[PDB]
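Supplementary notes (optional reading)

For those who missed the lab, this is the record we used. Protein: glycosyl hydrolase family 71. Length: 349 residues.
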Amino acid sequence: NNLGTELDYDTFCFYYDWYGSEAIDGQYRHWAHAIAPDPNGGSGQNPGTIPGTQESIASNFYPQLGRYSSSDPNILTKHMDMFVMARTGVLALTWWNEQDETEAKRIGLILDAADKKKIKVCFHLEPYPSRNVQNLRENIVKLITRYGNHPAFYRKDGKPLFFIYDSYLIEPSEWEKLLSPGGSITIRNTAYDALMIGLWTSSPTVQRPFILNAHFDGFYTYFAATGFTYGSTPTNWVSMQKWAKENGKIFIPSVGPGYIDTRIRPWNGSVIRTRTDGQYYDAMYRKAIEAGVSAISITSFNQWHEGSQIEPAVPYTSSEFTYLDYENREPDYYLTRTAYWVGKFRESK
Ligand SMILES: Cc1cc(=O)oc2cc(O[C@H]3O[C@H](CO)[C@@H](O)[C@H](O[C@H]4O[C@H](CO)[C@@H](O)[C@H](O)[C@@H]4O)[C@@H]3O)ccc12
């Protein structure tokens, strides 16, 4: 079929599975959240907490689905239908290395739900305690062994793909051991080989030799807030793509619809990026496409604390907070606008 509605499997949408309810988790996990002290506010701060009540959740927006559980199979079905609406073929699942049965259950539920809609799943490997290339190898082996035969497990030209958040916190001399074909614990040419996509943060002077010396297959930028880093400044994307092409690397710029995290970081207003009825998202997505990249990542499906979510949000005013909402747009606007941009992306692939 050639309907212009099909999923795109070079479009990766960052997905968070850390939400709970008192009932599916024993607590409205993540809907309740600590408020961060101001790093420039001095000692003795008592910033308090957001209790995750109906009235007061840890977001500047309010989900259409309410204070949902990421383990609720009925929520997961709805989320996969939202991915289908957005045409986002790959769910890039945040992975925290919790090593508990509830994590294992949730990952299985997500894979199963995704497969029903032909969605694929890859892992976004977060920075967990004592993360290093040896335990990262062991965890890559574990993920590929546990999930690699699941029909929803993502592969690109036969290889799994991992996004590695905060990769720059591990020295290239360590990465080389894992990612050079000659590295002492290499995954190259093994059953556990994968496309490893590192987080490009700062200037090319630093990031170019890092990516080469660490033997990453590519890089992404994550941040939805334009100008937060060099990498998340879209005017740099043409140049970053040129360098990627010259060096055989895969650039997967990250685009998002806005940013606001001031419920949890009241002092962080400088990072706010207003949605302007979709114009911010449009501008950022257009820059990614114009850069001529082969793949795009979306920050985020549902990072509600960041205010970067494309998941449907609704107007809500409670006794505790007046939430932002999608304004003149309907709750599903960012899903349907994602589908629009996926179509434009596919037209120039
Ligand atoms: C200021 C700011 C701007 C922006 O564009 O994006 C972010 C993102 C932040 O962190 C989110 O994304 C990370 C990558 O997936 C993830 O590691 C973060 O979660 C972890 O850190 C937070 C504290 O920042 C912690 O509460 C959570 O339990 C994790 O340990 C988060 O999802 C932060 C700031 C931004």
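If you only remember one thing from this example: Residues 94, 126, 165, 222-225, 228, 259, 268, 271, 303, 306 surround ligand 1 (CB under 6 Å).
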